[PDB]
Amino acid sequence: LHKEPATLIKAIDGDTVKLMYKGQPMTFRLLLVDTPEFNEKYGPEASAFTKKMHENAKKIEVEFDKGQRTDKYGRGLAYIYADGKMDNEALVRQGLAKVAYVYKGNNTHEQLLRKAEAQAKKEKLNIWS
């Protein structure tokens, strides 16, 4: 798997973001995670966490997995990195997302994320308190 450039266009919520990728605007959905929707508990905090991660980044990258690159809604499915740090991992480690939507063939970073989730639950963070 490999990292490719992208630039912020705009925040959407905890697990979706609008990025410019290969010079085209696209909505991206983070692989292997589920943040609460804005209107749910820890939804606002998830959206704030991801928004901040992308605003503060000098460099954003997207990394597709081996399988499907777009979902049925036309959203890109990727691991996204902010200054080298994986958003997907960072959300789970903070208890602001669960591991979820693990489909065969797009699951390269599953166990990395599950390790992060175990550590978040151990610490009873956010969604696990």
Ligand X SMILES: Cc1cn([C@H]2C[C@H](OP(=O)(O)O)[C@@H](COP(=O)(O)O)O2)c(=O)[nH]c1=O
Q: Is residue 35 a known part of a binding site?
A: yes
Sequential DSSP letters for 14-57: SSEEEEEETTEEEEEEETTEEPPPTTSTTHHHHHHHHHHHHHH-
16/91 Cα distance (integer angstroms)? 12
Q: Is 114 an active-site residue?
A: no
Q: Is 40 an active-site residue?
A: no
Q: Is 37 an active-site residue?
A: yes
Q: Which of residues 7-66 bind ligand X (CB under 6 A)?
A: 29, 31, 34
Residue number, 58 or 71, with CB nearest to ligand X: 71
- What residues have CB less than 8 Å from 121, skipping those under 6 apart? 95, 128
Which stretches of the chain bind Ca ion, using CB under 5 A?
15, 34-35
Which stretches of the chain bind ligand X, using CB under 6 A?
29, 31, 34, 71-72, 77, 101, 103, 106
**Binding-site entries for Ca(2+):** 15, 34-35
Which active-site residues does the annotation give?
Answer: 29, 37, 75
